[PDB]
Design a protein around this ligand. Structure first.
Ligand SMILES: Cc1ccc2[nH]ncc2c1/C=C/n1cnc2c(Nc3ccc(P(C)(C)=O)cc3)ncnc21
Length: 281
């Protein structure tokens, strides 16, 4: 039919149950797709930034990107409707987890899943622009997905320049981005370095006790966050690669993913055996 749009759903298909989290996600609701009795998440507005996130999510698809199910953007109130991620945002997940469940191998699994998604965006020539643990979502069996695509975009040049007044979450933001509003897949890699550090610390805040106003100056003097207690030497080396001052010196997400894939696989082996010991009590 002439007005068919594969993504546009009817608002009345969705029951809005309650606002998720603690207003901490803004206007994101747990809903039900009543036809199917499926729990969904729904972000609502009542614009350009909203519609831009809606547009971007139609273009990207991956096992580790939160899955768009549909939108209601023909008339207000606008909706973006996605799968429901059962455990919420990764930062709080890490802060409250049982570390016998969320063990060294699961920390590697998490980094493998996120870098898998970013390797995909990387070859799609997208940038994400807001990589952080608070912006990843967790499902069953430590399934992790990247979310929050409001600043994501398909790249036309090597660099995107955010508008003059823009402000950024300073502790995740690469030097060139802080100083010159320049973004690229490489400033995503820098933010991924910080995300790695959030994972390794089970969700500590970065640069603890360092004033936001001091951060760029410290970076320019080559200060970088210390290796967290318990963090594998190789993981920390990858963090430091992600935090190379010059963007072209940072690894690709292709390289990053491959390295974490390998480390994950090795760690799984010992984990699986340790599980089977212990079941033989
Ligand atoms: C609807 C929507 C539209 C565009 C988007 N871009 N990025 C995320 C989204 C979302 C939201 C995704 N999403 C899916 N499940 C979510 C969730 N789930 C959640 C599950 C459990 C809890 P608790 C531990 C308090 O019971 C809290 C939140 N919290 C926030 N966003 C979620």
């Amino acid at each position: 039919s002439p007005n068919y749009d594969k993504w546009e759903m009817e608002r009345t298909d969705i029951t809005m149950k309650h606002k998720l989290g603690g207003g901490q996600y803004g206007e994101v609701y747990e809903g039900v797709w009543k036809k199917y009795s499926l729990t969904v998440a729904v972000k609502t507005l009542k614009v350009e930034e909203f519609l831009k996130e809606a547009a971007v999510m139609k273009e990207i698809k991956h096992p580790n990107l939160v899955q768009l199910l549909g939108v209601c953007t023909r008339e207000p109130p606008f909706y973006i409707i996605t799968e429901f991620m059962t455990y919420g945002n990764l930062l709080d997940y890490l802060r409250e987890c049982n570390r016998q469940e969320v063990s060294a191998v699961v920390l590697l699994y998490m980094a493998t899943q996120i870098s898998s998604a970013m390797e995909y965006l990387e070859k799609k020539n997208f940038i994400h622009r807001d990589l952080a643990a608070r912006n990843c979502l967790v499902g069953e069996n430590h399934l992790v997905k990247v979310a929050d695509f409001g600043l994501s975009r398909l790249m036309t040049g090597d660099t995107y320049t955010a508008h003059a007044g823009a402000k950024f979450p300073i502790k995740w933001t690469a030097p060139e981005s802080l100083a010159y509003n320049k973004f690229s897949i490489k400033s995503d890699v820098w933010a991924f370095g910080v995300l790695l550090w959030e994972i390794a610390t089970y969700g500590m805040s970065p640069y603890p006790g360092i004033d936001l106003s001091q951060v760029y100056e410290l970076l320019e003097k080559d200060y970088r966050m210390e290796r967290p207690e318990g963090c594998p030497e190789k993981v920390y080396e990858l963090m430091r690669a992600c935090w190379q001052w010059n963007p072209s010196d940072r690894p690709s997400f292709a390289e990053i993913h491959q390295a974490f894939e390998t480390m994950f696989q090795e760690s799984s082996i010992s984990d699986e055996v340790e599980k089977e010991l212990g079941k033989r009590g």
